[PDB]
Symmetry: D2
Subunit: 115 residues, 4 copies
């Protein structure tokens, strides 16, 4: 599992559950093609998005549907969604954890790259 | 100014200077049209991107070119850029301050919305 | 003003108003002595805490009373308060801006230091 | 394990390893008494600080020695240390994860409270 996502709720101090996540890879038209997707689990995590063999070097976009999450809670949010765009390269470490901490008018995102 | 951007560097404890910023607006055809662009000043601020008359209801994307910023400092960062996507002015005109706090593997973004 | 504090509310997308702030300085005896205190304005800012003459080299503690702020809004937050502890002016006088971004279960603090 | 700590490095995009952590409980003199301590593991975590039986309701302080961590990396940091102060109460959930994301001039902290 080379790519994991974790999403936390800073209003309730809990994992962000059932949040939809879409992952795209940059195509050589400079166009985003769907790559993987899923919903966060009860621990706010999503793994199993891809495998080592298919996760090749390239530019990836992780899109988190934060607006639906806040509306589900009856909170009016600012952002349409949160996005994380990055390059994956085989030289450096090989396991990627993308974390996102959500508030109605702010978000923070962090990447942990190990091995 | 109805739209302002402020960018800070959490490694040096300073404003992030000469960071390129591009703003887009979602068009009729669901395409991102270029709306305004600029570079942050010595105070890490960008104003004067638009006027209240031109800044109509719509969905906007503020893209902050963080990778060029870190690479010019000698650091290879995780993200390609930081993006903020939001609906603006749908309940009447407002003023928006978009702030971003940057680190090589993390960033935080906050919006302040005033009437 | 050599020491300023700015506090923002990430749930409402606004400055955090009337937040109490207390500043302490570590004394000879390794005790925290009260140094200055105040409340943030309608812009979420506090200035006028000290002068360059009084703001000598030392270790300072800025304590932001976040719990009272959230409780007055109807929310029971995680933290008792946010604290920032730092050495100031040890290489000559500087100006410090301490910013805090607040959510009920999370906060971020940033310092901007200028010569 | 009712209390876990996790510390991440936003400059290197990795766990913060070998960081010292001290935990204090508020005594009825309004004095902080040592409660537990340890160093973060290679995954940036510290568990086993206390047990369900000893972790009773009270006010706790988690102190992370961030200044030594940055100096070990040859980076000049702003803060003397990072502190998290909170009340534990038996009504609500019972498992506490305190996370801290570290930059030289900024830190963010989040609490996840489950069950």
């Amino acid at each position: 599992c080379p790519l994991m996502v974790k999403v936390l709720d800073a209003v309730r101090g809990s994992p962000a559950i059932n949040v939809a996540v879409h992952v795209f890879r940059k195509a050589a038209d400079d166009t985003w093609e769907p790559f993987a997707s899923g919903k966060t689990s009860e621990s706010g995590e999503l793994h199993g998005l891809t495998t080592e063999e298919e996760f090749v070097e390239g530019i990836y976009k992780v899109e988190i549907d934060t607006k639906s999450y806040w509306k589900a809670l009856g909170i009016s949010p600012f952002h349409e969604h949160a996005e994380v765009v990055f390059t994956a390269n085989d030289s450096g470490p090989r396991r990627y954890t993308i974390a996102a901490l959500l508030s109605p008018y702010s978000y923070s995102t962090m990447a942990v790259v190990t091995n």
